[PDB]
Paper text:
The DEAD-box ATPase [name] (also known as [name]) is a multifunctional regulator of nuclear mRNPs. [name]-2.1 is composed of three subunits, LENG8, [name], and [name], and shares the latter two subunits with the nuclear pore complex-associated [name]-2 complex. Cryo-EM structures of [name]-2.1/[name] and [name]-2/[name] identify a conserved trigger loop in the LENG8 and [name] subunit of the respective [name]-2.1 and [name]-2 complex that is critical for [name] regulation. [name] contains an N-terminal motif (NTM) and two RecA-like domains (RecA1 and RecA2) that form the ATPase core.
Full-length [name] and a [name]-2 complex containing the middle region of [name] (residues 358–1000), [name], and [name], hereafter referred to as [name]-2M, were used for cryo-EM studies. The interaction between [name]-2M and [name] is dynamic, and thus we employed a photoactivatable unnatural amino acid, pBpa, to stabilize the [name]-2M/[name] complex through photo-crosslinking. The resulting photo-crosslinked [name]-2M/[name] complex was subjected to cryo-EM studies. ADP was included in the cryo-EM sample to mimic the post-hydrolysis state of [name]. The resulting [name]-2M/DDX39BNTM+RecA1 structure shows that [name] is in its post-hydrolysis state, bound to ADP and features extensive interactions with [name]-2M involving both the NTM and RecA1. The N-terminal segment of the NTM (NTM-N, residues 9–16) contains several acidic residues (E9, D12, E14, D15, and D16) and binds to the basic groove formed by the WH domains of [name] and [name]. The NTM-C connects to the RecA1 domain of [name], which is cradled by [name] and [name] with a buried surface area of 2202 Å2. An extended loop of [name] (residues 674–688), hereafter referred to as the trigger loop, directly contacts ADP. The R678 residue of the trigger loop stacks against the adenine moiety of ADP via cation–π interaction. Intriguingly, R678 from the trigger loop of [name] would break key interactions between ADP and the F381 residue from [name]–RecA2 of the [name]/RNA complex. The [name]-2M/[name] structure traps a state just after ATP hydrolysis while ADP is still present (step 3).
Numbering used by the authors:
A (entry chain B): 5 to 398
B (entry chain A): 603 to 981
C (entry chain D): 9 to 16, 38 to 251
D (entry chain C): 16 to 69
Write the structure that this text describes.
Amino acid sequence: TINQYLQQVYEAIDSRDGASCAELVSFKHPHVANPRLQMASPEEKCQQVLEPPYDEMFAAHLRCTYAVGNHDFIEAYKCQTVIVQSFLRAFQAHKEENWALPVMYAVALDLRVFANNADQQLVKKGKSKVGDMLEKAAELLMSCFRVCASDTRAGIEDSKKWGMLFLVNQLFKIYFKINKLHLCKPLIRAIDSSNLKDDYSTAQRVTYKYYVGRKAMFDSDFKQAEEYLSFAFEHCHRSSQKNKRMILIYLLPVKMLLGHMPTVELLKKYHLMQFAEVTRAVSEGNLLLLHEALAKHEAFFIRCGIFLILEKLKIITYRNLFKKVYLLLKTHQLSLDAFLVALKFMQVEDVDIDEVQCILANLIYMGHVKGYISHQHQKLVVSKQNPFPPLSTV
Amino acid sequence: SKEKYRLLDQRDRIMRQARVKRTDLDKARTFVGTCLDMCPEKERYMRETRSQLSVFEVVPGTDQVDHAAAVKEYSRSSADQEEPLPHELRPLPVLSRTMDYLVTQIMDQKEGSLRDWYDFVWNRTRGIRKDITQQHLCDPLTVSLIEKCTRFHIHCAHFMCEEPMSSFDAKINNENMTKCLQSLKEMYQDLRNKGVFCASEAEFQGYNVLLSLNKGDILREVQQFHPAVRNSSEVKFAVQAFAALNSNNFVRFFKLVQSASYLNACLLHCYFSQIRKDALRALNFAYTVSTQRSTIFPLDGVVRMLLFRDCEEATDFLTCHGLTVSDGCVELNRSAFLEPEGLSKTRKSVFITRKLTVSVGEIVNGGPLPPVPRHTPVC
Amino acid sequence: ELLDYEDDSYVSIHSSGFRDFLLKPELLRAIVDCGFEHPSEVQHECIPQAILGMDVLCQAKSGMGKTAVFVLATLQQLXPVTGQVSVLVMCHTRELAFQISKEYERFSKYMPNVKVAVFFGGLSIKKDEEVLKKNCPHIVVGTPGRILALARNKSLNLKHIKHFILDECDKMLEQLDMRRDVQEIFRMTPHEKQVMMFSATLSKEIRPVCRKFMQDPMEIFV
Amino acid sequence: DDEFEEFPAEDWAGLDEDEDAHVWEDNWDDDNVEDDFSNQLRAELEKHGYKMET
Ligand SMILES: Nc1ncnc2c1ncn2[C@@H]1O[C@H](COP(=O)(O)OP(=O)(O)O)[C@@H](O)[C@H]1O
Ligand SMILES: [Mg+2]
């Protein structure tokens, strides 16, 4: 009954057990599906039992459950905004206590989801854009992050900073969703500066590593991104196969740009066979097959956001093609016109001797080719030993 | 004119004292401009009294103000800006007329210094964009006006590059280009979400990419475009330029420069020094067998590949990096190459100038010029 | 005659609008009504840090827009409670305090529940005490002498301060007495707060003094 | 679908993690030129006069 629910809420608040209160607020609990708890105006009973601001929060929670029962997610989002604000006031009221951290996990995480629903319930009416509710939820999450991070004087085992990374991830899940980056810089700086960086929970660390690895990949930092995405993929939960596939989607181009090629079994296992041809072409120095494969799955790569990143494999393809030319001719003094013929066989548009020389000069400078160019003889003289050093050492 | 200016100031003071403040968000009232002139009367008289006119806004041969020629000035407001009154803002038709006047009567003037011309046009386009922003204008016509502002700034990014710092600051011009492109992107997204599509978007998105060739993140943004915009020829050219620059493919980069439009070439001119320095580093490392001996490389190859005006400019570029040039053969030496300290002065490329086959007004307008507006303001 | 081979970060301007800072719609409406074009370099660098309630130390030329950064930040992260003062801004001159007050009144156009007050030397303490007693503000802008006088006699409750800000802090900390008063005011305020200090000429000798007031700040110098 | 969903638990200590011992192959970069594409490229080079010396 409602009286039993309110008494249980009061006892949980008095006993200061975060898990029980979080369950009594979270929608994951079956009590939201309980028909008798859903009410339209239960604030009178909440006022009698619960002391402020908890009474307002739980009245808003009951109203939110009633609204969700009717599939009115705009009212649910407004009620959940009231939830977040009331709980933030209550949480700030606490001093040197972090027992209410799981409640913040139950409340804030529930807000964002509702925003999505509200968002996809506002496209139908056409009275709002895509992401306004997400922006409001991001503002609420920023308030929560401020409350958690401002507590720098409490004990190690009694601080609210344990709730930082979680909130950061939530903000990430909005920033990438509404395509609004560059707000991740303060969050990354705060997480790096924090001494609890390696002490957060494994799930939050994996999520943070995945998002920061994506951001570093888009910043052409293919070593930091490689490290972050490797950590995320290695420690991802076995049950969440979708998360492993999503991490691997961005881990593959970074690893291939560093000279590592995924096996066919890996692509088959995680249903990423779109890369299967690409990994082959870069292995064979086949520019034509690489272009055809990137065009065949262009929609998938643009959807993932790695198509133009995958276009950067052209340098490794050039290196492999020139290595194949060197192995076919079996001489250390290779005429540049041989490389021109090889490039024309790959149907490179507007390719001539000047562009071949430019490509070879860049490969030599970056260390991919251990040789020099003789302009008088128009040849390439490579090292007799180790002419093409492995890409892992470049 | 001082008495008229003070009377207009008193009128505005009374009208603003009638204005209310401290309103709720839902009760907000967006501003609707009512100025039928290119410049407000009060601002005209104010700048006439204070002797702050540009050369274009005065009657020739005197310091008196040709009111039909004066254009509203950007002034950054202040903490005491006192809000814009309705008659201090020009509506969208008046803004379009002002932009037409700028592109038809001012952007081709030859008399007067380059500094005065650039300052006048830049400040007046800033004023137009401020009037657009304060009125919450989001329409294809406003998009066109901001597009013309962006085109003017893109042209000046190369036309004025040889001027002294007191005449043209490259950093400020680049910032203005970036702000104009940001406004254009915001309005494009708003109109697309509202069900309206802009014909010229595919052009300026490309400019955006050409303005962010050193920022990898732009790639992500390029993959977020509408399929019509992303598959357009302009965006394809911009992505090709990005790939050429980031892969240090200077031959391909300058081939793209040769086969580019005037504004695309003007945007690509910003990376000439960087790409040439990287190219010289790569060539010096790749054409030298040992650090102790030098190798002769044809100067004609350097001129052709790096798109230099003639042998003299290439010789100066090579000498500024410590390499000896003689008999049309630069002696590439691995131990003699050195990157100079302090950026060298930039000069306009002849090819980009040759690409300008029409007037500046037509390039900024994006097409044939509209008829010159004729509007004598009412006292 | 071929000799065998002998074996042996450019940056771009960042672009963003005020809508990209996820400000409150009232703040964005007030900004666009003010005709702000776009965040400047200092604004783009400092606003994302300042919104999250973290300390910042900024050095930039006059007119770059340092004051607007903290005005927008403190308006964004404001939880207006009747009877409490949550934002305290201090500067060494009355004119600067009135400029800050004008900025606050200018950006809080669509926030009718926000109150701002200014307390400065040259007036009587009775007016400031009456303002505190009758209509308590949420934002207090003042000079260290007047603020210290109002705090010593238990007229200004500084125990609820969440945003401690110094404007043109270099010349305020160069003075010995002003620095001592600022130190006392900082000691009166609670520890859990964000500190933002902005100045036009941050000498390297004063920088340790500025960083003494903060905890792991973001420092910008141009 | 383009969302990183929340994990069912908060910590797993590495016991329940999908193990991929040999995921990235390292011996792909070899001197093997016997594949079909190598034969096609060799035929093209032979056509254009560039032939491996005996
Ligand atoms: N991003 C911006 N766009 C347009 N105008 C601005 C911007 N930032 C500040 N301003 C204006 O410029 C003036 C700068 O004053 P102030 O904020 O005190 O800068 P500073 O603190 O660097 O001296 C302010 O009056 C403000 O109205
Ligand atoms: Mg200032």
